Design a protein around this ligand. Structure first.
Ligand SMILES: [Mg+2]
Length: 224
């Protein structure tokens, strides 16, 4: 019955639309090294979904026992962007385009809800997923004060789309993201695209779990 109440599907970008997480984790790891801090690739994955600013500050708290200054945030963030974009551009997660076609064909509105401030990725959405997304139906780092795992971004999305929590579904791949969608009170589907135990996504409050975007796409008509 939830099924025909649906009006919008809310996608995270990294690890859901683009296969960028290998790169994000590498870039975080490396830029932290340069600044003289230990952030493993694995921990970088655990931070997926946060804004850059929130990530940097938390790493500073866990490692040095203090806040990062505003200048430290901008400086590390700029460098992280350089490192990220110095890799061959991230490609589409297999299945993402085909699922978006299924979503659109069912008359549903695609939205992006992301902690990303990476303009290279944000501006590539249209080129990769043509006709799917619009700026006014997106939430990015630029919109939020807190970001995931706070529900704030997902609540902003509902409002931007003029939706009620029961008129939406969230597609997330990372625990902080699942958590934010869940706390926004939205039915949340986890897709385990990363190197994580699918359990951690269930623990974060995911209503359904899939191993890949392809599997999710294949089972889209089964979902209720
Ligand atoms: Mg993600």
């Amino acid at each position: 019955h939830m099924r025909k109440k649906l009006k919008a599907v809310l996608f995270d970008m990294d690890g859901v639309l683009f296969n960028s997480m290998p790169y994000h984790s590498e870039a975080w790891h490396q830029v932290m090294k340069t600044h003289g801090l230990d952030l493993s690739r694995e921990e970088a994955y655990m931070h997926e979904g946060r804004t850059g600013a929130s990530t940097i500050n938390i790493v500073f708290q866990r490692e040095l026992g203090k806040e990062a200054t505003q200048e430290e945030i901008e400086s590390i963030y700029h460098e992280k962007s350089i490192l990220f974009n110095s890799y061959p551009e991230a490609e589409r997660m297999p299945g993402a385009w085909e699922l978006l076609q299924k979503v659109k064909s069912e008359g549903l509105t695609p939205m992006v809800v992301t902690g990303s401030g990476q303009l290279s990725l944000l501006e590539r959405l249209e080129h990769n997923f043509p006709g799917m997304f619009h700026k006014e139906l997106m939430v990015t780092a630029f919109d939020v004060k807190y970001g995931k795992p706070n529900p704030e971004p997902y609540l902003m999305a509902l409002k931007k789309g003029g939706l009620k929590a029961d008129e939406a579904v969230v597609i997330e791949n990372a625990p902080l993201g699942v958590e934010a969608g869940h706390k926004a009170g939205i039915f949340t589907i986890a897709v385990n695209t990363g190197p994580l135990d699918g359990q951690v996504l269930l623990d974060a409050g995911a209503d359904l779990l899939f191993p890949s975007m392809q599997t999710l796409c294949d089972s889209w008509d089964t979902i209720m």
